[PDB]
Paper text:
5M mutant lipase was derived through cumulative mutagenesis of amino acid residues (D43E/T118N/E226D/E250L/N304E) of T1 lipase from Geobacillus zalihae. Lipase (triacylglycerol acylhydrolase E.C.3.1.1.3) is a class of enzymes belonging to the serine hydrolases and is widely known as important biocatalysts. The active site of 5M is located at the center of the structure covered by two alpha-helices functioning as the lid.
The 5M crystal fitted the monoclinic system space group C2, signifying unit cell parameters of a = 117.59 Å, b = 81.27 Å, c = 99.52 Å. The 5M mutant lipase has a total of 21 α-helices and 11 β-sheets in its 3D crystal structures. The active sites of 5M mutant lipase composed of Ser113, His358, and Aps317. Both molecules in the asymmetric unit were highly similar, and the superimposition of alpha carbon atoms gave a root-mean-square deviation (RMSD) of 0.7789 Å. The zinc-binding sites in both chains composed of residues Asp61, Asp238, His87, and His81 in a tetrahedral formation. The calcium-binding site was coordinated by the residues Gly286, Glu360, Asp365, and Pro366. The mutations of amino acids in the 5M mutant caused the destruction of the ion interactions and hydrogen bonds inside the lipase structure, as shown by decreasing ion interactions and hydrogen bonds number.
Author numbering: 2 to 388
Amino acid sequence: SLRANDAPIVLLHGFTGWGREEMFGFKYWGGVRGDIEQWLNENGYRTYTLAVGPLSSNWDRACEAYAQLVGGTVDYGAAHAAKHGHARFGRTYPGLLPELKRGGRIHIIAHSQGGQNARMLVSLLENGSQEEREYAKAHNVSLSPLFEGGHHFVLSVTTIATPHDGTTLVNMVDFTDRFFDLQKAVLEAAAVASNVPYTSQVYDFKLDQWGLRRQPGESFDHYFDRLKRSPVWTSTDTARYDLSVSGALKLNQWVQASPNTYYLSFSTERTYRGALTGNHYPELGMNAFSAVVCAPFLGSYREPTLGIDDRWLENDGIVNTVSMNGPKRGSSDRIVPYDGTLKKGVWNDMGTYNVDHLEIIGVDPNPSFDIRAFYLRLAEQLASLRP
Ligand SMILES: [Ca+2]
Ligand SMILES: [Zn+2]
């Protein structure tokens, strides 16, 4: 379709992810297939990459995304900081797109928990935070323009394999141990070891707010064990919490669709229905870690009281496919299956793809999936959107 808008693309990672200079240059967006930002740019779709805290709360990552985009010191809010016990202020950024302050807009393409992070940034841009505005007045302290409301610079959000209603994987007995083993597998796919105390940061978790950092002489193995016991794994202000079915419910209750923004969901599935009791099993080609450690659980876990029945068993290795088309559990957002015309203010469900959680970003191979073709056709669609 004809190009109707000049808004640039921002790629936003999941509960794992890292900037373009990190991980010795192994891109999260393209992995072993190449560099997805490079593909869109060289095909005339100007594209940028955000890097926020992968284990942090969506709230933290919205404030991190904001500063990273417009430029400034990350401002988590005086109130939120007091309530949860971390720094009000994080890293300073120069700003990728200061023209957002002057009328420029962006399309966000987000993977995994990134789709929650993207939705929430919109909701804060539009409404801000009553509580922050209240707190800034009471204790005579500065307010981020983010908490004010009346901002708007996101023309479209696209979610790819996003736990909008959470993932049942979080309810696994040993999820803690199994989740940081996922972080290690991603490292290994990056050709980075978990048992070597690298001098340089390699993978920065951006836990400035919690005063956490991998230390001189500290391995990722030893660091992850330490993060397991830390507030970025034990508190409600975390990716862990937001990622649970109860986390997404509580997020859905306050993070709604802006009428000024297009939402596209892409769902993923990489499972087959078994004959014995209708459980779901990993297809051939699923990333080894998911196929062994995550999928068997995802595609047999039931809670009939929490609505978690057979619709929840199909999974992309990591997320229950049903959770992906858009928010439902605790949401009044509308979900319309794609009919050739993209609608503002609603979820354009662009369908389910035979592609696993890590294949869809190229962190695992799948020759059957044309990853260049997928991301180009998406950029072409987002460029076609009426502003
Ligand atoms: Ca594969
Ligand atoms: Zn926080």
